[PDB]
Amino acid sequence: EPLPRIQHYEDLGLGLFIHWGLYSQMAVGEWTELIHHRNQHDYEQLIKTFTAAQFDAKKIAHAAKAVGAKYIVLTTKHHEGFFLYDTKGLSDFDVMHAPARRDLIAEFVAACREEDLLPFFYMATYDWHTPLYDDDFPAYLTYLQKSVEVLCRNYGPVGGFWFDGNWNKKDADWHLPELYGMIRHYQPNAIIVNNTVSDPEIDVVTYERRTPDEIYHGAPNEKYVAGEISITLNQHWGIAANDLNYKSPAEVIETVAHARHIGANILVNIGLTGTGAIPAAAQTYMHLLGRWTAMAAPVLYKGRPVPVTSAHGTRDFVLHTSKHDFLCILDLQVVGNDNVVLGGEGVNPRSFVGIGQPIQRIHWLDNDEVLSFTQDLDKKVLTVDATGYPYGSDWVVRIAQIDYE
């Protein structure tokens, strides 16, 4: 049974992932320093032009609020090893030694608090900047733990930590009891996420978007751990100007719904410009997804997976809250007329197995249309006529609320 902080985590549902660092100035992806075999001295000169001139934490927080996100995961230090906060003497490779001369993480947590969002800190554990990483790993771990200690002690209550990189050394001892134990001492309520069972103090495991089945919550009678999937809008996480291979807004909506189906949270990622602006492309996705999440509000946060399956050949699924069940229905088409056929005009029976209580009424959330339905209570079959979209709309994942008698 989940600890309160993890229950609260699962109620967040949707977070925004923000990638911003020195890489952002080159606009060819966040891994550029390594994958393009850049000269380290020349790449790290980018600290000198890191102005943060267009970074507005209140605009980030406002974007999150508008898209229906409840937490934000910001890259505090990526593999490039540059810190977006005041490391208080630990490293000169930080934003206090850049022209920005602002603790951006402090601006970030203040903006989050004003919008009632949880601030999460991403921290790369695989570091390309410190020579310690390759030639004195135990000392690197001390450096890493100290960089996290700063975040635990100088910014008030933090929502969580998102660690990424332990996979670079699958068989090393990362001394996680001491790292996570330090976090638990100063930040007892923080959610700990490791992007890979790795330590008892982890609260959340990450999974690929395509995972088809309800996620695993840990061994029976051990600590419940939550899950989270991630999606980026094109192929890269940092900004990438000539990556045109953007996903459909429809795919992003389906992926958000899919997360809730398998009992995970989801992060939708955006890459800021060099100077910290939200690109216009990201705003388009946010506005579209935002329309969906506003409509889905009654179920997106509290809704949980339930042992109810859909009929053969259909990708529909069900989510449960303590007051209601919700049918999440896909592959609908638009309704035209007798004379103008768009595909959604015929009766469209969609069935579910595992609904055992008599229903009084079912309605679409988007327009409160009442659906017809039939029930076989002995076999727990619900069949609804899932009407198509009114002409001029298309929600991609449409949601019907069940009111039980």
Next chain:
Amino acid sequence: EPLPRIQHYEDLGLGLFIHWGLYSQMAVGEWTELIHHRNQHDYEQLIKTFTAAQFDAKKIAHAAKAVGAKYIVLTTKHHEGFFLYDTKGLSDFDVMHAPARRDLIAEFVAACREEDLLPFFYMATYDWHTPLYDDDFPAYLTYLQKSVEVLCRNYGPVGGFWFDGNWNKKDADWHLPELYGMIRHYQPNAIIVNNTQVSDPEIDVVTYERRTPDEIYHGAPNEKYVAGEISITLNQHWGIAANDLNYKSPAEVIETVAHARHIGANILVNIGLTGTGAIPAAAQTYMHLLGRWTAMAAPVLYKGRPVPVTSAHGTRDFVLHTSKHDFLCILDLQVVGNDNVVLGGEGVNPRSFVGIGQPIQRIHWLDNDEVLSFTQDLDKKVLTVDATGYPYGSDWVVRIAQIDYE
């Protein structure tokens, strides 16, 4: 062999489709009056709030220029039957009787001319506003022909006409020789498109489904050559539709543009303006992404034509021909990482083509001028190239290699 005006049409490659009318104020699609069974009197009151307050023809023309489009097709009158121009006494249901009180078509053609774009006029032939349509069809045809005559005589030279609606009455006599003959009299070089072998000899262009798989038909050997055109809209509707979130991937839009050129057709990419005539922010995102692709593809996008060269089994690659070069259009590439970071594109990736019989000197990607390795079997006309993956930080969706022949 195509008439000059049709050759010029086929060189345009890409156009913008703009849907704007009274429907735009309701933001639930262009067919709303019919499909939502609206009260006609109440729907037509929307003329009273048709302000055109945010319509800027120069911004439309600039958007076209930036995306690589060379013509624009604007809805002058849709099925709702409201005219965006001065009908000069033919109808009171026009923009001169709206608060806009501006001839929007005149603003449109002037903006097109200053950016060197061809203005095209969409005109619905199936009309829901005039009672003539159902009660006196021969008189309706006179009304329709007159509405087109105005466009033929008051706006200077027009690029073309895009007619839509004859399919509402498959078996009627639409008197096309008189309608198209009047156009030919006042606008001899206009391209005529009918969205419907050919339904009149004066038609220059037939429309096709985007998914049409093979090179389009141009007419029988002793007959007039007719061109082709496909269309894509970014979501499910053509007019603006606020709760239509079912937008296509930008990647699909790029592929569809490339596909059009493969089958020897032009393509229209459609945008639906807001009630007041603004380009919505969502459309701008697609235009910027497509615009990056079309700028990179410029050496072949306009002049490139289909050729009898096929690609190997299991591949969607294809070839386009210019008088100077051939171009390999290659899909489903992945990004190149390293030995240690595998993203999918790092191995040698031989892609083959059948029908290249001349020796090649050099082949290079046009996005970054990388030279490709290749082998040839000139007897069987096989070209095989190592189509390298994208450098990390980029992904063009359809990547194009230029062939330089010996």
Next chain:
Amino acid sequence: TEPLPRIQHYEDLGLGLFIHWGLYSQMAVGEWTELIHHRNQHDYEQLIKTFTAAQFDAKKIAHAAKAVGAKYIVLTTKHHEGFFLYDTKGLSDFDVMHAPARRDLIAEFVAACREEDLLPFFYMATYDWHTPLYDDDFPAYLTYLQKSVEVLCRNYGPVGGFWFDGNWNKKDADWHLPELYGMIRHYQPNAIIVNNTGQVSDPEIDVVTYERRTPDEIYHGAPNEKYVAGEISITLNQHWGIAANDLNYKSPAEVIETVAHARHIGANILVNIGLTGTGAIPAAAQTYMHLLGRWTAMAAPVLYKGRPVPVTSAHGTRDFVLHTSKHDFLCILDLQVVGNDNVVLGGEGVNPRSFVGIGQPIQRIHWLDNDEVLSFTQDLDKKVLTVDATGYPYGSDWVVRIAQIDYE
């Protein structure tokens, strides 16, 4: 509007067997071998001298049709090679009476068909590679062709039909079909006439042929025009004549599904077998016949009389409905086998399958294979039927399973 009685009777046949047998069969490399392998004509036609027909038993062919549930047989009386499997009575020396067989095989064939109550159909190639008339005297070739058909119309009793193939070799020629089909109508007024081409080719045509993949109910003609039926064909591998090194055989399951599909679109279906050079049914064909035969015996209540009806299945499903005057039938695909709670094979959970277009209250629904009663719910206003389509009992798998609806 309503089909001529002979065409109604044709549509009730449902399933026929197509039988390819000729001189080509002796070489076992496909029926088009003479042309496609560029064979020397003199040497190829020598095969008449070894055409013994020593293992041909028309009763065994008829029995194979009977046991697979077929109600007619289409036998190749003369294929493109131009060799006749019957006594042409002086028209040609290139016939079975001038082979060592010295027997009229078509006479054996129709007597066997009659004893099993099957309709004998005669396949006749109109594109002929033997007679010089085809290339040097087309008008006389037509006379030769018409005469070869006349013999079939006058010496073998009542014939079920004719299956013509080859007019596509000369798309623009005058084939004198009014005279050919008019002669058939004179001697065999009830014969079904089928013309295989790539608007029908003549008013006397009764049946058009179509691709197996045809997705929708076939077209029968406008209401004031003659109703024409349809037929699809399938062969077990890639060739129609026997082909020893063609290993590219279809799954028996696909054959079953294709037969079901035919009925769904309102067509008959021919399943083809290629005999050996001596006229035997090869053992591979027998395997398919026995499996399909199990299916067709179970499907008998609907296979013959069942017709398409405007009832669709739910999203995601390939199920369909067939109508008879007494019942409707749900034809359900993609079911799995039921194990139990502990042994999971895929079919054990409740499996709602829905249909749109059933307006009348139902009393009972049952699987034909084992008479199990299915549970169902109905919304009569929207014409929805939803049934719990249980999986196969362990040890069976019908591929297309069929439930009978008994209406109130």
Next chain:
Amino acid sequence: TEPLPRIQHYEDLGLGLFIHWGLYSQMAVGEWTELIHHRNQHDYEQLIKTFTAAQFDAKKIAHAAKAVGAKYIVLTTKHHEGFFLYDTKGLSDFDVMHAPARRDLIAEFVAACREEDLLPFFYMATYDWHTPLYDDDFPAYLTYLQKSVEVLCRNYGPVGGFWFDGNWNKKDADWHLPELYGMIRHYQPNAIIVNNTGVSDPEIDVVTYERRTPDEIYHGAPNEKYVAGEISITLNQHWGIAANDLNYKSPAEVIETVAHARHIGANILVNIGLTGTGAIPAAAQTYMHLLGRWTAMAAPVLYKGRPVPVTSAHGTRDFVLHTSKHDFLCILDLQVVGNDNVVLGGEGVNPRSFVGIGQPIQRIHWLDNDEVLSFTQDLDKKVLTVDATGYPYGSDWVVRIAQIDYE
């Protein structure tokens, strides 16, 4: 790291026949019928009284295996029903010596195998529905199981291997495999040991895998014992005979699955279910005759061919197999060649490419008809491209194989 000799020899067998025959065969509704149909045990086990084996001829089985190209046979010596097809010498009365057959069928089987140079393998179910020991005294069951295996290890001469199936019924129990497999190694040191799981002990030689396994199989960690792999296919949905299972796979799928096995570096078993009295049913003979044509043509590579780090071009399912003398291109999705006038699909030039061939080639030819193929090479990038011509009219091999002769 290197395979033990017996396991190398196992990997050279390539194809084996799996034979399901037991009391279940008399009901023809699948091999699990006694449990899944909730049969009364007394009534089901009465089938011992009609187990005549009147149509079982081991020499015909062995001859059929030889003709299909198989080099070993895996015969069900006892399935879950717990009935033994051999003389258990007092261990159980529920065996073939107490049936009217009154012949040790396993002895006939091994003698037949030896005279056709096939390896006899014994399938043995470890999950047993007959003995009350299984549920009531598991340690004593394990002794019974090990004793039934001792008999097979001592009374039939050299055995090719053992194929165990059922440990998955008790995932968490101690099956005492060191003692069972140690006794096998004592009497039958050369036997292949296969355990069907879903590496359970150091003595296992072979792991079983799903047919759809996409990539070269895992052989164990680099300094550890090399273990081979094996996939299985049955012709319909059941392993024992099942008269109203009409859901048979295409012969073409069976051919492709055999080729796939070799691609991923596994053997494959093709299964048949005998009739109640032990005959090969007519449907199984059809599949064996078709597969047999393919395996005879594929002989030069089916046994000795191994996976190699060579990939095929995008969108193609083609692959390469290596022997010490040759490489072989296995090419799928071909069509038949007609003429200028008659188009069947295969007539155009059909370039199929491979990455990882680094040595210059002299000649490439189809095995089925010795036609020479045209090819081009880029030796620096290790690209081979061939024009894979279509089938001559009248033939279609499903997986066509070209032999490469190196300079």
